[PDB]
CSV table of C-alpha atoms and ligand atoms in Angstrom, one decimal:
chain,number,residue,atom,x,y,z
A,148,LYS,CA,100.8,-12.5,-34.8
A,149,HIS,CA,99.3,-10.9,-31.7
A,150,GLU,CA,99.5,-12.7,-28.4
A,151,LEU,CA,97.5,-13.0,-25.3
A,152,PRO,CA,99.5,-11.0,-22.7
A,153,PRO,CA,99.8,-12.8,-19.3
A,154,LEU,CA,97.9,-11.3,-16.3
A,155,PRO,CA,100.3,-9.3,-14.1
A,156,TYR,CA,99.0,-11.4,-11.1
A,157,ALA,CA,97.7,-14.9,-10.4
A,158,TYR,CA,94.2,-15.9,-11.3
A,159,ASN,CA,93.3,-16.0,-7.6
A,160,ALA,CA,95.1,-12.7,-6.7
A,161,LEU,CA,92.0,-10.4,-6.9
A,162,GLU,CA,89.9,-12.5,-4.4
A,163,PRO,CA,87.4,-11.9,-2.9
A,164,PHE,CA,86.6,-8.9,-5.2
A,165,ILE,CA,86.8,-10.9,-8.3
A,166,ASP,CA,86.7,-14.8,-8.1
A,167,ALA,CA,89.5,-16.9,-9.5
A,168,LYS,CA,87.3,-18.9,-11.8
A,169,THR,CA,86.0,-15.8,-13.5
A,170,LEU,CA,89.5,-14.3,-13.9
A,171,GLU,CA,90.8,-17.5,-15.4
A,172,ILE,CA,87.8,-17.8,-17.9
A,173,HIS,CA,87.7,-14.1,-18.5
A,174,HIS,CA,91.3,-14.2,-19.6
A,175,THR,CA,91.9,-17.7,-21.1
A,176,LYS,CA,88.5,-18.0,-22.9
A,177,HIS,CA,87.0,-14.5,-23.5
A,178,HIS,CA,90.2,-12.5,-24.1
A,179,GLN,CA,92.0,-15.3,-25.8
A,180,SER,CA,89.1,-15.6,-28.3
A,181,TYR,CA,89.4,-11.9,-29.3
A,182,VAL,CA,93.1,-12.5,-29.9
A,183,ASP,CA,92.4,-15.6,-32.0
A,184,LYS,CA,89.7,-14.0,-34.0
A,185,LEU,CA,91.8,-10.8,-34.6
A,186,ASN,CA,94.6,-13.0,-35.7
A,187,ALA,CA,92.5,-15.0,-38.2
A,188,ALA,CA,91.2,-11.8,-39.8
A,189,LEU,CA,94.6,-10.2,-40.2
A,190,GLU,CA,96.0,-13.4,-41.7
A,191,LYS,CA,93.8,-12.6,-44.7
A,192,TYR,CA,95.5,-9.2,-45.0
A,193,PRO,CA,99.1,-9.8,-43.6
A,194,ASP,CA,100.2,-6.2,-44.3
A,195,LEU,CA,98.1,-5.4,-41.3
A,196,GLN,CA,99.9,-7.7,-38.9
A,197,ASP,CA,102.5,-4.9,-38.5
A,198,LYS,CA,100.0,-2.6,-37.0
A,199,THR,CA,99.4,-2.0,-33.3
A,200,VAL,CA,96.0,-2.9,-32.0
A,201,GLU,CA,95.5,0.9,-31.4
A,202,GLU,CA,96.3,2.0,-35.0
A,203,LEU,CA,93.9,-0.7,-36.2
A,204,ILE,CA,91.1,0.6,-34.0
A,205,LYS,CA,91.9,4.2,-35.2
A,206,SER,CA,91.9,3.2,-38.8
A,207,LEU,CA,88.8,0.9,-39.1
A,208,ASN,CA,87.3,2.8,-42.0
A,209,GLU,CA,90.6,2.1,-44.0
A,210,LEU,CA,90.5,-1.7,-43.3
A,211,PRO,CA,89.0,-4.0,-46.0
A,212,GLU,CA,85.2,-4.1,-45.6
A,213,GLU,CA,85.3,-7.9,-45.3
A,214,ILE,CA,87.0,-7.8,-41.9
A,215,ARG,CA,86.2,-4.3,-40.7
A,216,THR,CA,83.6,-5.5,-38.2
A,217,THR,CA,85.7,-8.5,-36.9
A,218,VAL,CA,88.5,-6.1,-36.2
A,219,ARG,CA,86.4,-3.4,-34.6
A,220,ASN,CA,85.0,-6.0,-32.2
A,221,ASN,CA,88.1,-8.1,-31.6
A,222,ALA,CA,90.8,-5.5,-31.6
A,223,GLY,CA,88.5,-3.5,-29.4
A,224,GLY,CA,88.1,-6.5,-27.1
A,225,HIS,CA,91.8,-7.2,-26.9
A,226,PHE,CA,92.6,-3.6,-26.3
A,227,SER,CA,89.9,-3.1,-23.7
A,228,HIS,CA,90.6,-6.3,-21.7
A,229,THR,CA,94.4,-5.5,-21.8
A,230,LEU,CA,93.8,-2.1,-20.1
A,231,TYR,CA,91.3,-3.7,-17.6
A,232,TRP,CA,93.9,-6.3,-16.4
A,233,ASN,CA,96.7,-3.7,-16.2
A,234,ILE,CA,94.8,-1.1,-14.2
A,235,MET,CA,93.9,-3.7,-11.5
A,236,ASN,CA,96.3,-4.9,-8.8
A,237,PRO,CA,96.0,-7.1,-5.6
A,238,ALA,CA,94.1,-5.0,-3.0
A,239,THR,CA,96.5,-2.3,-1.9
A,240,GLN,CA,96.0,0.6,0.5
A,241,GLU,CA,94.3,3.3,-1.6
A,242,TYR,CA,96.8,6.1,-2.5
A,243,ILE,CA,95.8,8.3,-5.4
A,244,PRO,CA,98.8,10.3,-6.8
A,245,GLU,CA,98.7,14.0,-6.6
A,246,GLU,CA,98.7,14.8,-10.3
A,247,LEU,CA,95.7,12.5,-11.0
A,248,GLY,CA,93.9,13.3,-7.7
A,249,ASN,CA,94.2,17.0,-8.5
A,250,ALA,CA,92.8,16.6,-12.0
A,251,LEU,CA,89.9,14.5,-10.7
A,252,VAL,CA,89.0,17.1,-8.1
A,253,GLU,CA,89.4,19.9,-10.6
A,254,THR,CA,87.1,18.1,-13.1
A,255,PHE,CA,84.4,16.3,-11.0
A,256,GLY,CA,84.1,18.0,-7.6
A,257,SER,CA,86.1,15.7,-5.5
A,258,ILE,CA,87.3,12.1,-5.5
A,259,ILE,CA,84.0,10.8,-4.1
A,260,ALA,CA,82.1,12.8,-6.7
A,261,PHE,CA,84.1,11.1,-9.6
A,262,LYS,CA,83.6,7.7,-8.0
A,263,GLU,CA,79.8,8.3,-7.7
A,264,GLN,CA,79.5,9.4,-11.4
A,265,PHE,CA,81.7,6.5,-12.6
A,266,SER,CA,79.8,4.0,-10.5
A,267,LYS,CA,76.6,5.4,-11.7
A,268,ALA,CA,77.5,5.3,-15.4
A,269,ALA,CA,78.6,1.7,-14.9
A,270,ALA,CA,75.3,0.8,-13.2
A,271,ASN,CA,73.4,2.4,-16.1
A,272,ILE,CA,75.0,0.5,-18.9
A,273,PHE,CA,72.3,-1.2,-21.0
A,274,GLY,CA,73.6,-4.5,-22.3
A,275,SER,CA,77.3,-5.3,-23.0
A,276,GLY,CA,79.8,-2.5,-22.6
A,277,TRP,CA,82.3,-0.6,-20.6
A,278,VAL,CA,82.8,2.6,-18.6
A,279,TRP,CA,86.0,4.6,-19.1
A,280,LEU,CA,87.9,7.4,-17.7
A,281,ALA,CA,89.5,9.2,-20.8
A,282,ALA,CA,91.4,12.3,-21.7
A,283,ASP,CA,91.0,14.3,-24.9
A,284,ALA,CA,93.9,15.8,-26.9
A,285,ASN,CA,94.1,18.6,-24.3
A,286,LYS,CA,94.1,16.3,-21.2
A,287,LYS,CA,90.5,17.1,-20.3
A,288,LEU,CA,89.0,14.2,-18.4
A,289,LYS,CA,85.5,12.7,-19.0
A,290,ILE,CA,83.6,9.5,-18.1
A,291,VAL,CA,82.6,7.6,-21.2
A,292,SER,CA,80.1,4.9,-21.7
A,293,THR,CA,80.5,2.5,-24.6
A,294,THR,CA,78.7,-0.5,-26.2
A,295,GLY,CA,80.3,-3.8,-27.2
A,296,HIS,CA,84.1,-3.3,-27.3
A,297,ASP,CA,83.9,0.1,-28.8
A,298,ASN,CA,86.3,2.4,-27.0
A,299,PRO,CA,87.6,6.0,-26.8
A,300,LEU,CA,90.5,5.4,-29.1
A,301,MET,CA,87.7,5.6,-31.8
A,302,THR,CA,86.8,9.2,-30.7
A,303,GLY,CA,90.4,10.3,-30.7
A,304,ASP,CA,90.8,10.1,-26.9
A,305,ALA,CA,93.3,8.6,-24.4
A,306,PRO,CA,91.8,5.9,-22.2
A,307,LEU,CA,93.1,6.0,-18.6
A,308,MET,CA,91.0,3.3,-16.9
A,309,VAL,CA,88.0,1.2,-17.6
A,310,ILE,CA,85.6,-1.3,-16.0
A,311,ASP,CA,84.1,-4.2,-17.9
A,312,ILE,CA,80.4,-4.4,-17.6
A,313,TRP,CA,79.8,-7.4,-19.8
A,314,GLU,CA,77.9,-9.8,-17.5
A,315,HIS,CA,80.7,-12.4,-17.9
A,316,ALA,CA,82.9,-10.0,-15.8
A,317,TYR,CA,80.7,-10.4,-12.7
A,318,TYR,CA,77.9,-13.0,-13.1
A,319,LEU,CA,79.6,-16.0,-11.4
A,320,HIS,CA,80.2,-14.1,-8.1
A,321,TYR,CA,77.5,-11.3,-8.2
A,322,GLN,CA,74.9,-12.6,-10.7
A,323,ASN,CA,72.5,-9.6,-11.3
A,324,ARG,CA,74.0,-7.5,-8.5
A,325,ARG,CA,76.2,-5.4,-10.8
A,326,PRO,CA,76.3,-2.5,-8.3
A,327,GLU,CA,78.0,-4.8,-5.7
A,328,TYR,CA,80.5,-5.8,-8.4
A,329,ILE,CA,81.2,-2.1,-9.2
A,330,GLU,CA,81.6,-1.3,-5.6
A,331,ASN,CA,84.0,-4.2,-5.0
A,332,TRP,CA,86.1,-3.3,-8.1
A,333,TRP,CA,87.3,-0.1,-6.6
A,334,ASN,CA,89.3,-2.1,-4.1
A,335,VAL,CA,91.6,-3.6,-6.8
A,336,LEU,CA,91.8,-0.4,-8.9
A,337,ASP,CA,95.5,0.4,-9.3
A,338,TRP,CA,95.7,4.2,-9.2
A,339,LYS,CA,99.4,4.1,-9.8
A,340,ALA,CA,98.8,2.5,-13.2
A,341,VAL,CA,96.1,5.1,-14.0
A,342,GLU,CA,98.5,7.9,-13.0
A,343,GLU,CA,101.2,6.4,-15.3
A,344,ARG,CA,99.0,6.7,-18.4
A,345,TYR,CA,97.9,10.2,-17.4
A,346,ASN,CA,101.4,11.3,-16.8
A,347,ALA,CA,102.6,10.0,-20.1
A,348,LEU,CA,100.2,12.3,-21.9
A,349,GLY,CA,102.6,15.0,-20.8
B,292,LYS,CA,50.5,-1.2,-14.3
B,293,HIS,CA,52.4,-3.9,-16.2
B,294,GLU,CA,53.1,-7.0,-14.2
B,295,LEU,CA,55.6,-9.9,-14.1
B,296,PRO,CA,53.7,-13.0,-15.3
B,297,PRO,CA,54.6,-16.1,-13.3
B,298,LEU,CA,56.6,-18.8,-15.1
B,299,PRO,CA,54.5,-21.5,-16.8
B,300,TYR,CA,56.5,-24.2,-14.9
B,301,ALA,CA,58.6,-24.7,-11.7
B,302,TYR,CA,62.0,-23.1,-11.3
B,303,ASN,CA,63.6,-26.6,-11.5
B,304,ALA,CA,61.5,-27.7,-14.5
B,305,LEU,CA,64.0,-27.1,-17.3
B,306,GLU,CA,66.9,-28.9,-15.6
B,307,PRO,CA,69.4,-29.9,-16.6
B,308,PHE,CA,69.2,-27.7,-19.8
B,309,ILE,CA,68.6,-24.6,-17.8
B,310,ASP,CA,69.5,-24.5,-14.1
B,311,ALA,CA,67.0,-23.6,-11.4
B,312,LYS,CA,69.1,-20.7,-9.9
B,313,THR,CA,69.3,-19.0,-13.3
B,314,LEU,CA,65.6,-19.4,-13.9
B,315,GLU,CA,64.9,-18.0,-10.4
B,316,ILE,CA,67.2,-14.9,-10.9
B,317,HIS,CA,66.6,-14.5,-14.6
B,318,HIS,CA,62.8,-14.2,-13.9
B,319,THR,CA,62.5,-12.6,-10.4
B,320,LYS,CA,65.4,-10.1,-10.9
B,321,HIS,CA,66.1,-9.5,-14.6
B,322,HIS,CA,62.6,-9.8,-16.0
B,323,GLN,CA,61.0,-8.1,-12.9
B,324,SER,CA,63.4,-5.2,-13.4
B,325,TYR,CA,62.2,-4.5,-17.0
B,326,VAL,CA,58.7,-4.4,-15.7
B,327,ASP,CA,59.6,-2.1,-12.8
B,328,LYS,CA,61.6,0.1,-15.1
B,329,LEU,CA,58.8,0.2,-17.7
B,330,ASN,CA,56.3,1.1,-15.0
B,331,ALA,CA,58.5,3.9,-13.6
B,332,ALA,CA,59.0,5.5,-17.1
B,333,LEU,CA,55.2,5.5,-17.6
B,334,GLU,CA,54.5,7.1,-14.2
B,335,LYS,CA,54.5,10.6,-15.7
B,336,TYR,CA,52.2,9.6,-18.7
B,337,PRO,CA,48.8,8.2,-17.6
B,338,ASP,CA,47.7,8.3,-21.2
B,339,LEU,CA,50.2,5.6,-22.1
B,340,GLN,CA,49.6,3.4,-19.1
B,341,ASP,CA,46.6,1.8,-21.0
B,342,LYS,CA,48.8,0.6,-23.9
B,343,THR,CA,50.1,-3.0,-24.4
B,344,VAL,CA,53.8,-3.7,-24.3
B,345,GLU,CA,53.4,-4.4,-28.0
B,346,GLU,CA,51.8,-1.2,-29.1
B,347,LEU,CA,54.4,0.6,-27.0
B,348,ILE,CA,57.2,-1.1,-29.0
B,349,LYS,CA,55.3,-0.3,-32.2
B,350,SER,CA,55.0,3.3,-31.4
B,351,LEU,CA,58.5,4.2,-30.2
B,352,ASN,CA,59.0,7.0,-32.6
B,353,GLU,CA,55.8,8.7,-31.5
B,354,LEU,CA,56.4,8.3,-27.7
B,355,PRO,CA,57.8,11.3,-25.8
B,356,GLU,CA,61.6,11.5,-26.4
B,357,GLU,CA,62.2,11.6,-22.6
B,358,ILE,CA,61.2,8.0,-22.3
B,359,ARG,CA,61.7,6.7,-25.9
B,360,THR,CA,64.9,4.8,-25.1
B,361,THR,CA,63.8,3.4,-21.7
B,362,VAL,CA,60.6,2.1,-23.3
B,363,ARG,CA,62.4,0.5,-26.3
B,364,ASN,CA,64.7,-1.3,-23.9
B,365,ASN,CA,62.3,-2.2,-21.1
B,366,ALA,CA,59.2,-3.0,-23.1
B,367,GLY,CA,61.6,-4.8,-25.4
B,368,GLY,CA,62.9,-6.7,-22.4
B,369,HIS,CA,59.5,-7.5,-21.0
B,370,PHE,CA,58.1,-8.6,-24.3
B,371,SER,CA,61.2,-10.7,-25.2
B,372,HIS,CA,61.5,-12.4,-21.8
B,373,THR,CA,57.7,-13.2,-21.9
B,374,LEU,CA,57.9,-15.0,-25.2
B,375,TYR,CA,61.1,-16.8,-24.1
B,376,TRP,CA,59.4,-18.3,-21.0
B,377,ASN,CA,56.3,-19.2,-23.0
B,378,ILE,CA,58.1,-21.0,-25.8
B,379,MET,CA,59.9,-23.3,-23.4
B,380,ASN,CA,58.4,-26.3,-21.6
B,381,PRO,CA,59.8,-29.3,-19.6
B,382,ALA,CA,61.8,-31.5,-22.1
B,383,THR,CA,59.6,-34.0,-24.0
B,384,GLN,CA,59.9,-36.0,-27.2
B,385,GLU,CA,60.3,-33.6,-30.1
B,386,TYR,CA,57.1,-33.3,-32.0
B,387,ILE,CA,57.0,-30.5,-34.6
B,388,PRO,CA,53.5,-29.7,-35.9
B,389,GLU,CA,52.8,-30.2,-39.6
B,390,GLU,CA,52.1,-26.6,-40.6
B,391,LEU,CA,55.2,-25.3,-38.9
B,392,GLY,CA,57.3,-28.3,-40.0
B,393,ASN,CA,56.2,-27.9,-43.6
B,394,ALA,CA,56.9,-24.1,-43.6
B,395,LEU,CA,60.4,-24.7,-42.1
B,396,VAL,CA,61.2,-27.3,-44.7
B,397,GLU,CA,59.9,-25.1,-47.5
B,398,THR,CA,62.0,-22.1,-46.3
B,399,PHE,CA,65.2,-23.7,-45.0
B,400,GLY,CA,66.1,-27.0,-46.6
B,401,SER,CA,64.9,-29.3,-43.8
B,402,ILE,CA,64.4,-29.1,-40.1
B,403,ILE,CA,68.1,-29.8,-39.4
B,404,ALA,CA,69.0,-27.0,-41.9
B,405,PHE,CA,66.9,-24.5,-39.9
B,406,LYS,CA,68.3,-25.6,-36.6
B,407,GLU,CA,71.9,-25.2,-37.9
B,408,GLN,CA,71.2,-21.7,-39.3
B,409,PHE,CA,69.4,-20.7,-36.1
B,410,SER,CA,72.1,-22.2,-33.9
B,411,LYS,CA,74.8,-20.4,-35.9
B,412,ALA,CA,73.1,-17.0,-35.8
B,413,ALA,CA,72.9,-17.4,-32.0
B,414,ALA,CA,76.5,-18.5,-31.7
B,415,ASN,CA,77.5,-15.4,-33.8
B,416,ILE,CA,75.7,-12.8,-31.7
B,417,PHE,CA,78.2,-10.1,-30.6
B,418,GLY,CA,77.3,-8.7,-27.2
B,419,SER,CA,73.8,-8.7,-25.6
B,420,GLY,CA,71.0,-9.8,-27.9
B,421,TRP,CA,68.5,-12.4,-29.2
B,422,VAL,CA,67.9,-14.6,-32.1
B,423,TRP,CA,64.3,-15.0,-33.4
B,424,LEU,CA,62.2,-17.0,-35.7
B,425,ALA,CA,59.7,-14.5,-37.3
B,426,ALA,CA,57.0,-14.3,-39.9
B,427,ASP,CA,56.1,-11.5,-42.3
B,428,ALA,CA,52.6,-10.3,-43.4
B,429,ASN,CA,52.5,-13.4,-45.7
B,430,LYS,CA,53.8,-16.0,-43.1
B,431,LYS,CA,57.2,-16.1,-44.8
B,432,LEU,CA,59.7,-17.2,-42.2
B,433,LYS,CA,63.1,-15.8,-41.4
B,434,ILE,CA,65.8,-15.9,-38.7
B,435,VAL,CA,66.5,-12.5,-37.3
B,436,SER,CA,69.4,-11.4,-35.0
B,437,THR,CA,68.9,-8.4,-32.8
B,438,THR,CA,70.9,-6.4,-30.3
B,439,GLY,CA,69.8,-5.3,-26.8
B,440,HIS,CA,66.1,-6.0,-26.4
B,441,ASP,CA,65.4,-4.9,-29.9
B,442,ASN,CA,62.9,-7.2,-31.6
B,443,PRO,CA,61.0,-7.9,-34.8
B,444,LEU,CA,57.8,-6.0,-33.8
B,445,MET,CA,60.1,-3.0,-34.6
B,446,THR,CA,60.3,-4.2,-38.3
B,447,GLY,CA,56.6,-5.2,-38.6
B,448,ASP,CA,57.2,-8.9,-38.2
B,449,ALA,CA,55.5,-11.5,-36.0
B,450,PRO,CA,57.9,-13.2,-33.5
B,451,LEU,CA,57.3,-17.0,-33.3
B,452,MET,CA,60.2,-18.0,-31.0
B,453,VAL,CA,63.3,-16.5,-29.6
B,454,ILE,CA,66.4,-17.5,-27.6
B,455,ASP,CA,68.0,-15.1,-25.1
B,456,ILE,CA,71.7,-14.7,-25.8
B,457,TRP,CA,72.4,-12.2,-23.0
B,458,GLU,CA,75.1,-13.8,-20.9
B,459,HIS,CA,72.9,-13.9,-17.8
B,460,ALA,CA,70.8,-16.5,-19.6
B,461,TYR,CA,73.6,-19.1,-19.4
B,462,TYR,CA,76.7,-18.0,-17.6
B,463,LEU,CA,76.0,-19.8,-14.3
B,464,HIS,CA,75.8,-23.3,-15.9
B,465,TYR,CA,77.7,-22.8,-19.2
B,466,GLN,CA,80.0,-19.8,-18.5
B,467,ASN,CA,81.6,-18.9,-21.9
B,468,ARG,CA,80.3,-22.1,-23.6
B,469,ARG,CA,77.3,-20.4,-25.3
B,470,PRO,CA,77.2,-23.1,-28.0
B,471,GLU,CA,76.6,-25.8,-25.3
B,472,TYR,CA,73.7,-23.6,-24.0
B,473,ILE,CA,72.3,-23.1,-27.5
B,474,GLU,CA,72.5,-26.9,-28.1
B,475,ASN,CA,70.8,-27.7,-24.8
B,476,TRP,CA,68.0,-25.2,-25.4
B,477,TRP,CA,66.5,-27.1,-28.3
B,478,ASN,CA,65.6,-29.8,-25.8
B,479,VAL,CA,63.1,-27.5,-24.0
B,480,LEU,CA,61.8,-25.6,-27.0
B,481,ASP,CA,58.0,-26.0,-27.0
B,482,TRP,CA,57.1,-26.4,-30.7
B,483,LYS,CA,53.4,-26.5,-29.9
B,484,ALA,CA,53.6,-23.0,-28.6
B,485,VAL,CA,55.5,-21.9,-31.7
B,486,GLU,CA,52.9,-23.5,-33.9
B,487,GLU,CA,50.1,-21.7,-32.0
B,488,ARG,CA,51.6,-18.3,-32.8
B,489,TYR,CA,52.2,-19.4,-36.4
B,490,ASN,CA,48.7,-20.7,-36.7
B,491,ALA,CA,47.2,-17.5,-35.4
B,492,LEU,CA,48.7,-15.6,-38.3
B,493,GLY,CA,46.0,-17.3,-40.4
C,778,FE,FE1,85.1,-9.0,-20.6
C,779,FE,FE1,67.5,-12.4,-20.3
């Protein structure tokens, strides 16, 4: 049975960039519910309780039709919120590690250029979705926009970082001012965590 | 140039079912934006500036590809928000007009049965979307769920009423408790307006 991972920090630890109430609801209501709903679907097909969230996402078309959609949405949700919590950290002096910084500069023109493109893709999401940094099988980086809780695992890629652009992520403190939310979010991005995932790809 | 119609009632008029702040922002920021965005997409195409939001939606596939998506989304948005404001009114005593009442009973089992199925479809929306009551060429009724600002004009149907299930519609007062928002919304549904649209279909 999958379980809601605790946040690596307190509900009020990302203030003022993300408000405490949101963080608490975002985790204990929105994320919790993806877990609950994933759990209930897999209970009908227990042989799938032994799969990782990621191998579920990558094998959607082999799951029974009955639950395929629930899983795509809810495993997607669980996975995507898990990454989101884990690549944020209480506001720390920005230091980008060399390996990740160099790759960003090589790919986009500079750090600022990547931030701009990422910010812009996030501003341009229509409806509920996410904006990712992701690597392909060959460690090539791209910025990816997705709808719902779809994600790059589905297109055979390795997610490195992501921002939640569902309105629930920012409405209580920013209402419609999503760009202000995106700009604030950079202050709690944990580059160290992003580096870790990058590095692990070898 | 398309314009933002004013609300048919005060910003505080749907309290406590819909809060004033939401109404202000939902209208002056979110709705305004679909208008502004629609206008900007049409700037290069004076031949299309003469068309109604509805004939734009009906002609998506024939529009220039450059703007097809922006129009779908922003005409969709304009149209859908416009109906939404206009099918709400300050909370009064429920009176459902006979023609509409009879059709609902004939189609669903009873009024309560229709409210249940409608409420349920709205509760089960994944992501950003809307739930509609809609009529076909023959005034047969159905409940339709859509994603984004997609809408039943796209399937050749006549929209009668709709509820906005984007999170911005309800997050400030209900946060994650969408069912509570759905339940409260029935109190300000203007059945007379719904009847009027039904009646017009002959
Ligand atoms: Fe979220
Ligand atoms: Fe809306």
